Amino acid sequence: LPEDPKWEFPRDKLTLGKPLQVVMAEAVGIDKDKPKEAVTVAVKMLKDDATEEDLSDLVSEMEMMKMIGKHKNIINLLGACTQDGPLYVIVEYASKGNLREYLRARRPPGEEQMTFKDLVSCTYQLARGMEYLASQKCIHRDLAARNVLVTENNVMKIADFGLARDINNIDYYKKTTNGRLPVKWMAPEALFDRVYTHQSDVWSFGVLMWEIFTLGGSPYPGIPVEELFKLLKEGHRMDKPANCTNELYMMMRDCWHAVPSQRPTFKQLVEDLDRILTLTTN
Amino acid sequence: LPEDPKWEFPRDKLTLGKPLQVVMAEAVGIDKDKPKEAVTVAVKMLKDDATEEDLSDLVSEMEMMKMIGKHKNIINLLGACTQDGPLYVIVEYASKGNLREYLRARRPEEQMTFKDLVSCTYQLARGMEYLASQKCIHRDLAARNVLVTENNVMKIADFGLARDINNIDYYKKTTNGRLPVKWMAPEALFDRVYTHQSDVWSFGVLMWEIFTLGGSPYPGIPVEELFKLLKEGHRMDKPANCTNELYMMMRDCWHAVPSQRPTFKQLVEDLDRILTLTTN
Ligand SMILES: Nc1ncnc2c1ncn2[C@@H]1O[C@H](COP(=O)(O)OP(=O)(O)CP(=O)(O)O)[C@@H](O)[C@H]1O
Ligand SMILES: Nc1ncnc2c1ncn2[C@@H]1O[C@H](COP(=O)(O)OP(=O)(O)CP(=O)(O)O)[C@@H](O)[C@H]1O
Ligand SMILES: [Mg+2]
Ligand SMILES: [Mg+2]
Ligand SMILES: [Mg+2]
Ligand SMILES: [Mg+2]
C-alpha cells in the first residue's frame, strides 16, 4: 500500500480494545489539536480468515471515505495504519451502535421510545447524508438500517462504505455487476439492467425508510429472497408501517417506482422531509 | 430453478429447527425405505439479507454435491426443496460440530490420542482422494469446513466454493478472490489457476490445524504480509504433537512447485501406512 502521510496514524499510539472485523480502540493524539488526548474510536481490520476480496474491499472502503469529504451525517474517517503491519482503518466511534439495533431496543414494551418526530428526524438526517454523497458522485449501494450508526447525541451516520463506488466505477451491463448487494434493499435496475445510479440508492433509501418506521423490522417479511424480484416486477410493494402517515408512506412508494427517473432525488426527499419535520415540531 | 425430481423433497415433510445460514431440522421419509420415520437433518438456506451471489453459491453448492457422489468422508446430500418457495439444501446432520471446534474442545471433551489425529487425517485424505477422482476441486478446505458425526466419522463439508476442475477462468484477475488467504496455494493468487494440487496445499494447512488441535495458521502474521513471506519460502513450524514424518508430509503439501506436491492418492497410501503402524 502506498504511503499517504496526511492520513497515516502511528501504530504505537493505538490501543486495540473489545470487538464491536471491527473493534473499539483508543487513539492518542489522533486529534491533532489535542496531541496527548486519547480518543475512543472504532477500528476495522481483516479477520484471520480474510480473503483477497476482503482486503480489496477494506482498501476500497478506506479510499472512498477519503474522497467523500466530511459531513454531519456520514461516519468520519480519522486515520489509518497502512504501513509495516496489518491494515487498520480508524473511524469515528458511534456509541449508540447501528440504527437497526437502536430502533429495536426502543420499541414499545408491548429504553426511551422513539417519538414520531424522532423517526422523521432520523429519516431527514439520513436523506441529507445521501444528498451530500450524491453531490460527491458517490453511490453507496448498500444502504440499510444495519449500515447506519448513531452517535451519543443521536446523530445519524451513514456507514459501511465497503461496497460504495464512484459513479463512474460501475461496469454497466456485465452479469457480474451488483452481484454482492443485499437483494431486499436492491433496486430492480441493479440486477435487471446491471447498472447503478443515485436513483438506485433512492430505492434503497425507501426500504431504509420502511425499516425506520417499522422500528427496525425486516423488509418483505415472509417473502423469500429468491421470489422477490418476480413480485416486484408484478408491482408488489411492502405495506404501510403502522403509525406511519399516508404521506410518509407515499414517499416510500415514490422511492419504489420501477422507473428510476420517476423516483424523487435525495434533494427532493430532503426538502419534503424538512417540511414534514418542521410542521411536526410546530 | 429447474426441477430435479430425483432430489426434490416435499416441504410439508420438513420441520425447521434451531440454528447450527444452517438450521437443524426433522425430515419425514427422507430415507425412502422408512417413509414414516423422521430424520434429524441439517438445512442450508439463504439469510434474509442474502445477495445474488449468495444464491448462486447455494445453487452451485447443491449442484456440486449432486455431481460428487456418495462417500463415507463427505457430508451426504439428502435432498432439496427447490420449487415454489425458498431454496433448502438438506444434508446429513453431524452431531459433533465442525472439526476446528471439536479439536479445541478436547484440548488438554475427551483428549485426542496421536492415533485419533492420524486417523482423522487419513479419513480426510480419503475423502479428498475420491473428491479429486470425481474431477472436483473444493477450494475451501479447512478444519472449520469439516464436520464430525456422532461416531467421530470425519466429513468434508461446505461446498460453497467447490468447482468442476474444468470450470475455471484461467489467468483472470478476479479468479480465486474469495478463498481464505491462509489456506490458499500460492499459484491460486499469483497465476490465477486452481488444480487438485492446489487442494493438497490446503490439505497441508488442514493437517497443521489438526495436529495443533485447531490452532490458527500463521500465528501473528497478518494476511496482508503472508504472500510475500510465502514467496520467500516461509512455512509454518512443526506442531509439537506431530511426528517429524507427519510434518515432512505437511512440508510436502506446501512445496512451491505444484506438481511436486504429493497427490491425494499418494497421501492416502502414506497415511494408511503410518496409521497401520501406529495402531500396531
Ligand atoms: N464506528 C463504529 N462505532 C460503533 N459501532 C460500530 C462502528 N463500526 C462498526 N460498528 C458495529 O459493527 C457493525 C458492523 O460494521 P460494518 O457494517 O462496518 O461491518 P463490516 O463492514 O465489517 C461487515 P458486513 O458487510 O457484513 O456488515 C455495525 O453495525 C456496528 O454495530
Ligand atoms: N450438516 C451439519 N451438521 C452440523 N452442523 C453443521 C452442519 N452444516 C453446518 N453446520 C454448522 O454450521 C457451520 C457453518 O457451516 P458452513 O461451513 O456450511 O457454512 P456456510 O457456508 O453457511 C458459511 P461460511 O462460508 O462463512 O462458513 C459449521 O462449521 C457447523 O458448525
Ligand atoms: Mg454492514
Ligand atoms: Mg461491509
Ligand atoms: Mg464454512
Ligand atoms: Mg460456505
Side-chain angles (χ1 to χ4, degrees), chain A residues 46-53 55 85-87 146 179-185 191 194 218-219 224-227, chain B residues 46-53 55 84-87 177-183 189 192 216-217 222-224:
Chain A
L46 295 178
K47 291 169 59 56
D48 204 53
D49 62 2
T51 65
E52 164 165 291
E53 191 182 56
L55 177 60
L87 177 62
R146 52 175 218 274
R180 297 163 63 215
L181 306 183
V183 176
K184 292 191 175 193
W185 281 265
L191 224 75
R194 300 295 177 174
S218 306
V225 322
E226 45 276 75
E227 306 192 322
Chain B
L46 296 179
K47 291 180 181 178
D48 202 20
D49 58 359
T51 70
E52 167 184 50
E53 189 183 64
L55 172 56
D84 315 312
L87 173 59
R178 297 193 292 155
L179 315 176
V181 171
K182 290 190 161 181
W183 283 261
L189 206 58
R192 302 300 170 181
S216 302
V223 305
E224 292 87 330

